[PDB]
Amino acid sequence: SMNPPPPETSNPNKPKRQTNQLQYLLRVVLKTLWKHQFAWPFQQPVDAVKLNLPDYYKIIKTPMDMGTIKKRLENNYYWNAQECIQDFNTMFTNCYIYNKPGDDIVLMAEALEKLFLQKINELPTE
Ligand SMILES: C#CCOCCOCCNC(=O)CN(CCOCCOCCN(C)c1ccc2nc(-c3cc(C)c(=O)n(C)c3)n(CC3CCOCC3)c2c1)C(=O)c1ccc(C(=O)c2ccccc2)cc1
């Protein structure tokens, strides 16, 4: 099987804006998670071809990753903060749906998810 195309990271038709919450999602939330020692499985789309996972995109029909989220924030793809928060929660849920619960990557995702949730608790006023 081929990999599906990656998620869209830009759309000219979409209006753009710079909100204090969108700045925080990029320069605090993503900045913190990106540099974490456990980021690297989540920094790009799951390459099912390279990793030989013929069932990944039979199970995961809403793929998401931090490389996509990064590009979306850089390209003002997101109007509301909750759109971006929705993409992070999708990335975590996909990892928990596909991988056996005793797997190393499940602990890695939970660590990044704990940090994500602490940084979201500190999001600034709209
Ligand atoms: C022969 C032949 C070819 O030769 C290639 C050589 O490649 C190794 C060298 N790598 C580098 O130079 C770059 N790099 C970053 C990536 O490193 C992770 C190692 O695997 C990379 C590739 N994989 C397997 C690879 C790549 C991407 C993957 N994505 C997934 C995956 C799969 C599924 C099913 C999924 O749901 N998700 C979300 C992601 N996998 C599968 C593995 C994920 C982790 O558990 C094992 C399966 C990936 C595997 C690093 O050097 C590096 C390392 C480790 C850390 C690190 O974590 C650390 C640890 C301690 C202290 C400090 C830092 C940091 C940087």
Side-chain angles (χ1 to χ4, degrees), residues 1-125:
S1 279
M2 287 175 71
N3 295 315
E8 219 70 57
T9 57
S10 66
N11 184 346
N13 306 44
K14 280 193 187 206
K16 297 180 182 171
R17 66 168 175 184
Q18 294 95 46
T19 78
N20 300 162
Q21 286 188 345
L22 278 173
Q23 273 275 45
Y24 183 95
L25 282 162
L26 177 59
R27 254 68 171 248
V28 182
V29 183
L30 181 64
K31 186 170 294 187
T32 305
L33 268 55
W34 194 269
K35 76 180 172 194
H36 190 282
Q37 60 173 127
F38 294 164
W40 62 264
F42 303 101
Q43 288 185 319
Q44 64 285 314
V46 170
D47 193 333
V49 165
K50 265 288 293 173
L51 292 179
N52 195 28
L53 311 178
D55 64 336
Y56 186 84
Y57 290 111
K58 283 185 193 166
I59 303 157
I60 301 300
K61 301 309 204 186
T62 312
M64 188 55 61
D65 65 278
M66 294 207 290
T68 297
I69 297 169
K70 195 178 183 298
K71 289 172 164 53
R72 289 184 166 196
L73 289 163
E74 276 156 1
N75 294 330
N76 315 267
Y77 190 86
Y78 300 125
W79 181 267
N80 292 329
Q82 274 294 325
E83 295 185 271
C84 173
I85 294 177
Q86 155 70 199
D87 282 352
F88 272 106
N89 282 324
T90 291
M91 178 186 82
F92 295 128
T93 304
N94 290 346
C95 179
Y96 305 147
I97 290 166
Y98 180 75
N99 300 289
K100 296 193 165 191
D103 278 1
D104 289 352
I105 186 162
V106 174
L107 292 183
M108 293 168 81
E110 279 173 355
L112 291 175
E113 192 191 349
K114 186 192 183 225
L115 192 39
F116 167 72
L117 288 174
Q118 291 162 342
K119 294 291 152 180
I120 293 309
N121 288 334
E122 290 206 328
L123 187 74
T125 196

